[PDB]
Amino acid sequence: VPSWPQILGRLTDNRDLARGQAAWAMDQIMTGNARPAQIAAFAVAMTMKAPTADEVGELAGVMLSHAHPLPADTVPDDAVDVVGTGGDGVNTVNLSTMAAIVVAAAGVPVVKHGNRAASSLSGGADTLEALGVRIDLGPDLVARSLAEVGIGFCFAPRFHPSYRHAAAVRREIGVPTVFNLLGPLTNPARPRAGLIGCAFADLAEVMAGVFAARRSSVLVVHGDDGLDELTTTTTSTIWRVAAGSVDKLTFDPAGFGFARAQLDQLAGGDAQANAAAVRAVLGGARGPVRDAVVLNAAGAIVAHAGLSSRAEWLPAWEEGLRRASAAIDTGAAEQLLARWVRFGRQ
């Protein structure tokens, strides 16, 4: 019979948990049954033990059990997510969010998991809010947005209200723990593909292992400059998840003709500033921010392509880049954002 002392004792002994134990712990947390001290002890102990993919998968599994689901038959089998852990401490423009709009405009269904900033100036949700997008729609309306606009946004606190018990605790601790891996792993629409950012180089393989268990087609990405995105300032490490397997790759955008950017060229500001950057990119402005958006959009398109076993790496990237660039250039991305705004108002 599981108990906090049994589980915390096992972790502080530097032992992997028995099957089901992480799930038991997470379920106690989600039902409001755990003391703040137990939540904090579990978060820290799991982090220092070094969590396994089995363990992180149990945590994410419990969250998804407690999440509001989308209605039956409303998420396309090939829907994709574009989201990261955050926590890279660099404060960039909102690359995942911009990429998502471009990806949707290219015709790939996007159901994005998102949230406000935890430490950056403006997170994906904050910037969407500044752009006039309704970020907090419930399951039925997200499904509708996806069908009618081509993109839906699942606001994490809206879909995971039981995770709130762990909220103050994680803020009070104030440093990242295993719980900081869970955002991209708990999209309530359960898309099977994704471009997934991870700020923590040494845990990205663990996140990839969780997606592999679900047989998702995902690229887990970590910029070698620290970004939880595909970067343009240097190479990125990619953990490619395909056919239940993980393959570690290094990716160099110079191989596709991208100029090296400086990190300050990608710097973000407050929500108004970041919204203006979105408008600039969608309006066709050339430069470092556009390049980074096109690259990340292409990455999500490659993840989507990977849902088929016949897809090949280089042609997939060349196609992703072509489609992402064209979605912007034709004005399809700009128009999709306007239509998304109108949807929320109507």
Ligand X SMILES: O=P(O)(O)OC[C@H]1O[C@H](OP(=O)(O)OP(=O)(O)O)[C@H](O)[C@@H]1O
Show the binding pattern over residues 172-191: x = contacts ligand 636 (CB under 6 A), - = does not.
Answer: --------x-xx--x-----
N-to-C CA span, the chain: 52
According to the annotation, is 97 in a ligand binding site? yes
Which residues sit opposite 196 in a β-bridge? 83, 220
Instruction: Restricting to residues 167-196, name those near its own copies by CB under 8 A.
Output: 168-169, 172-175, 177
Quick check: helix, strand or coil at residue 88? coil
Give CA–CA dist 91/103, Å, rounded.
23
Any idea of the CA torsion for 314, 241, 305, 196, to the nearest 10 degrees? -100
- CB nearer ligand X, residue 61 or residue 197: 197
Residue 120 interaction partner, one of ligand X, its own copies, ligand 636, none, beta carbon < 5-8 Å per kind: ligand X
Q: Rounded to whole angstroms, how far apart are CA atoms 23 and 33? A: 14
- 84 labelled ligand-binding: yes
Long-range contacts (CB closer than 8 Å, 24 or more residues apart) made by 328-333: 328/102, 328/105, 328/281, 328/282, 328/284, 328/290, 328/293, 328/294, 329/284, 331/284, 332/105, 332/106, 333/101, 333/102, 333/105, 333/282
Q: From ligand X, its own copies, Mg ion, none, which one binds at residue 36 (CB under 5 to 8 Å depending on kind)?
A: its own copies
- Residue found by looking up tokens 């423009």 in the block: 93
- Write down the least CB distance from residue 231 to ligand X, Å: 12
Q: Is 124 annotated as a binding residue?
A: yes
Q: Which is nearer to its own copies, 36 or 287 (CB)?
A: 36
Q: Is 95 annotated among the ligand-binding residues?
A: yes
> Taking CB under 6 A as the rule, does residue 160 contact ligand 636?
yes
Interface with ligand 636, residue 118, by CB under 6 A: yes
- Residue from 18, 19, 37, 201 touching its own copies (CB under 8 A): that is 37
Closest CA to 85 of 212, 216, 222: 222
Contacting ligand X within 101-160 (CB under 6 A): 114-115, 117-120, 123-125
By the rule CB under 6 A, 277 interacts with ligand X: no
- Under rule CB under 8 A, residue 36 binds its own copies: yes
Q: Could you say which of ligand X, ligand 636, Mg ion, none residue 209 binds, taking C-beta under 5 to 8 angstroms by partner kind?
A: none
For ligand 636, the closer CB: 90 or 316: 90
Q: How far is the CB of 87 from ligand 636 (least distance, A)?
A: 7
The structure tokens listed for 83 are: 């989201």
* Sequence-ordered alpha helix ranges (H) in the chain: 4-12, 21-30, 36-49, 53-66, 95-105, 124-130, 139-149, 156-159, 167-173, 204-213, 271-282, 288-305, 313-329, 332-345
35 in contact with its own copies (CB under 8 A): yes
List of residues contacting its own copies (CB under 8 A): 3-5, 8-9, 12, 14, 35-41, 43-45, 47-49, 168-169, 172-175, 177
Known binding-site residues for anthranilate equal 84, 115, 170
